[PDB]
Amino acid sequence: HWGYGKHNGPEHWHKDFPIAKGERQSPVDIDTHTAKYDPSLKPLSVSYDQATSLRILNNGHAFNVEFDDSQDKAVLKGGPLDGTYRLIQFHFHWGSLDGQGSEHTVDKKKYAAELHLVHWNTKYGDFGKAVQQPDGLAVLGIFLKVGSAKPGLQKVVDVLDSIKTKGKSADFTNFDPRGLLPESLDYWTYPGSLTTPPLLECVTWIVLKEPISVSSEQVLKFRKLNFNGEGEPEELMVDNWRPAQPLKNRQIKASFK
Ligand SMILES: NS(=O)(=O)c1ccc(O)c(NC(=O)NCc2ccncc2)c1
Numbered sequence: 001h002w003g004y005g006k007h008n009g010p011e012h013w014h015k016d017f018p019i020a021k022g023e024r025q026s027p028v029d030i031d032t033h034t035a036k037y038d039p040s041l042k043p044l045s046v047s048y049d050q051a052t053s054l055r056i057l058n059n060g061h062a063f064n065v066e067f068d069d070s071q072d073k074a075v076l077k078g079g080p081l082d083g084t085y086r087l088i089q090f091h092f093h094w095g096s097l098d099g100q101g102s103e104h105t106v107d108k109k110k111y112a113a114e115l116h117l118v119h120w121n122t123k124y125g126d127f128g129k130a131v132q133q134p135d136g137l138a139v140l141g142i143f144l145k146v147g148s149a150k151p152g153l154q155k156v157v158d159v160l161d162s163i164k165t166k167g168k169s170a171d172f173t174n175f176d177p178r179g180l181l182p183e184s185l186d187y188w189t190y191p192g193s194l195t196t197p198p199l200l201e202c203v204t205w206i207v208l209k210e211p212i213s214v215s216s217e218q219v220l221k222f223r224k225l226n227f228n229g230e231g232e233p234e235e236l237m238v239d240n241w242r243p244a245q246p247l248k249n250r251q252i253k254a255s256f257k
């Protein structure tokens with residue numbers, strides 16, 4: 001099975017998931033000079049006040065903080081989106097070094113990590129149906145650079161010792177995802193895909209211009225996770241990012257000029 005190693009990493013995924021070579025694959029490089037400012041883009045509406053986190057899970061590729069998505073508690077609307085998308089989970093991708101780790105790049109620049117807040121279009125009833133649809137998901141992507149700590153991330157960092165290995169989960173209630181958001185909600189947007197298998201072309205990507213800063217110690221704790229299950233040989237969970245894919249005939253739009 002697929003992963004991020006030398007024999008099963010991103011360049012291998014197309015053998016099991018042929019859509020890996022598709023027409024709207026993610027991530028991509030965001031060339032900020034070819035991005036098109038679109039005055040008709042609405043501001044993003046992020047309504048996380050009622051969010052209910054439930055638990056945190058090491059799935060062998062990243063860790064997911066999962067939310068109750070059985071009601072409109074934490075929703076994303078506006079921006080390029082029609083209708084309401086519900087937060088189901090967030091996770092991150094990160095590097096072995098501070099100089100790499102993000103999936104999207106900005107003018108070929110790589111950030112230390114990238115946060116994905118995953119939301120599904122409520123008109124499809126649940127996440128499983130939504131991923132089968134071209135407008136099924138909206139993923140809000142936020143870059144992390146290494147600098148000052150992000151206090152709102154610390155509760156995530158502190159529980160990672162409880163989920164070191166693949167398949168481990170821990171109760172993780174009352175986490176407020178608003179503490180992971182940068183000041184500005186200026187964004188780029190383009191149609192794309194999940195960045196891990198099954199690589200389905202179901203995502204409206206919304207990538208924030210402004211990164212959040214996290215401390216070196218915070219991202220180091222990410223790197224102490226393991227891809228392997230307990231009692232298997234230890235392989236650090238680092239470099240769990242897919243590289244940029246061809247833009248093909250897509251234009252990236254910007255909400256700001
Ligand atoms: N990166 S993303 O484009 O925001 C994204 C958003 C929502 C997703 O459902 C996926 N993809 C998966 O969930 N794949 C199954 C899986 C992945 C990792 N480990 C175990 C199982 C990727």
Ligand SMILES: [Zn+2]
Nearest residue numbers: 091093116195
């Ligand atoms: Zn992701």
